[PDB]
Recover the amino acids of this structure.
């Protein structure tokens, strides 16, 4: 019991002092390369130094996983024994502290690699050398996400094992709460390494002369942005299974509402981290549009940033769909009309989050195009930017509709189980408001898009381009009116469900 609770306690301490030595050997490793870069008078030699230095950091990241995986595998073993639920919780808190250490050590590795790339950029005179540096840094940061998610997948595995042994309810809520906070902590570690790597691409831009490399730094920025977004999506998928497994061993209804309530909060941090990395991506594009002197390059930047924004709305949508099936699952294990009414609210709260998240994506692609207009000269290239823009807007309506239909699908299940009359009435109340909040976003998006076509029409002369820009304005109002219709039809389908299920 305590003779093996003390054992894992001593295993975590050494694993944390190995991590403390892990990035210690990395800080010394970076300073050496910085000393060599400072003195090495070369250009193919600045790259070979950064290359093998980035590779040493990638290996040290794979080392931290070899420690954490062997350490987590041991914690699982000590859970196989131990009868006391009062001492599984001890073992569960020890695993959370361990994974928070590996992720802190992983962030510290990327920060040291972040320094090395900047040292490689000063001692690099050619544009071709700068771009090969950033392409090597994106390689390191992409393995930092992969190791960060691996630590998360192995922690939520430790939680799953401790849940099967858990007999008491309050022990389960603690296990769930402890491992949700780690997914949240890991979500912010991923956002930290994104902002760092994005600011390096900025300093890489400020050293570039040609317009060719500026496009290659935007492509390299778009690569990391999808990498950061899918890395957060995997985190969301990790907390989903932990939420489902925490419910299979959940005692009663109050424990399941609280498990879903904690689940929603994680899905929030995923939306707020997704938003923050999309804004960061747009600034790098804005820093790259300001310096671009050619329209053949300006178009390629906005088009790449809009693909990111579109893919952001789709990952915003999957995280919603992940959290919505889980809410449906929780309703299946609820016997109280009070705890099923409190599962519809937390669903309608996760819906308002995805829409405010969708809007912030839209607002980001707005100022992206706005900067593209100013960096564009000629009515033709201006219209194509608006074209690529309302494409983003059309995928904001569709993702909004899908967000509402997912919520109505959840209301349809809570209704079928709500055997009480005021519950049927309450579920319908809090549901139609998300449709009013949906049409409110659909109008906010349109106003935003309305300012942009007016902006484009001002910097336009060639009458034909005005006809093209007029066909897009008609296109945009068309898509948001359809989206407005597909939202009323959802509330109409749902208003005829409190009718059936109630007297």
């Amino acid at each position: 019991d305590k003779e093996i609770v003390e054992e894992v306690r001593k295993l975590v301490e050494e694993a944390k002092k190995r991590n403390e030595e892990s990035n210690e050997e990395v800080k010394k490793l970076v300073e050496e390369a910085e000393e060599a870069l400072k003195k090495a008078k070369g250009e193919e030699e600045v790259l070979k130094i950064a290359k093998e230095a980035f590779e040493l950091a990638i290996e040290a990241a794979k080392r931290n996983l070899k420690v954490a995986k062997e350490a987590f595998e041991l914690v699982i073993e000590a859970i196989k024994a131990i009868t006391d639920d009062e001492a599984v919780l001890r073992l569960a808190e020890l695993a959370a502290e361990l994974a928070k250490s590996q992720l802190e050590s992983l962030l510290k590795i990327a920060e040291a690699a972040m320094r090395l790339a900047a040292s490689a950029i000063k001692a690099a005179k050619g544009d071709e050398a700068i771009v090969e540096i950033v392409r090597l840094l994106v390689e390191v940061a992409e393995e930092i996400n992969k190791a960060s998610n691996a630590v998360v997948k192995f922690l939520v595995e430790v939680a799953k094992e401790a849940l099967k042994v858990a007999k008491g309810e309050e022990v389960v809520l603690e296990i769930a709460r402890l491992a949700f906070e780690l997914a949240i902590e890991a979500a912010k570690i991923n956002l930290e390494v994104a902002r760092l790597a994005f600011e390096l691409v900025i300093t890489a831009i400020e050293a570039i002369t040609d317009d060719e490399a500026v496009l290659r730094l935007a492509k390299l920025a778009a690569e990391l942005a999808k990498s950061q977004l899918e890395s957060l999506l995997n985190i969301a998928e990790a907390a989903m299974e932990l939420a489902a497994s925490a419910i299979k061993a959940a005692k009663g209804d109050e424990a399941i509402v609280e498990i879903v309530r904690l689940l929603v909060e994680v899905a929030k941090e995923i939306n707020k981290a997704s938003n923050a990395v999309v804004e960061f991506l747009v600034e790098v594009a804005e820093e790259a549009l300001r310096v671009a002197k050619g329209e053949e390059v300006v178009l390629e930047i906005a088009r790449l940033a809009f693909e990111l924004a579109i893919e952001a709305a789709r990952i915003n949508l999957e995280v919603a769909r992940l959290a919505f099936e889980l809410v449906i699952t929780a309703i299946e294990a609820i016997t109280d009309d009070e705890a099923v009414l409190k599962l519809a609210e937390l669903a309608a709260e996760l819906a308002k989050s995805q829409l405010e998240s969708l809007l912030r994506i839209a607002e980001a692609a707005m100022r992206l195009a706005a900067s593209a207009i100013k960096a564009a000269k000629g009515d033709e290239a201006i219209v194509e930017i608006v074209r690529l823009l309302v494409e983003v807007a059309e995928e904001i309506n569709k993702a909004s509709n899908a967000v509402v239909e997912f919520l109505v699908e959840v209301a349809e299940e809570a209704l079928r189980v709500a055997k009480g009359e005021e519950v049927v009435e309450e579920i319908a109340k809090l549901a139609k408001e998300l449709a009013d909040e949906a049409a409110k976003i659909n109008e906010e998006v349109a106003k935003l898009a309305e300012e942009l076509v007016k902006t484009a029409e001002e910097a336009i002369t060639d009458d034909e381009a005005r006809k093209k820009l007029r066909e897009l304005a008609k296109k945009l109002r068309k898509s948001q009116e359809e989206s407005k219709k597909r939202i009323k039809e959802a509330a109409e389908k749902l208003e005829a469900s409190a009718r059936k299920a109630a007297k």
In short: The chain is about 90% helix and 0% strand. Residues 127-165 form the longest helix (39 residues).
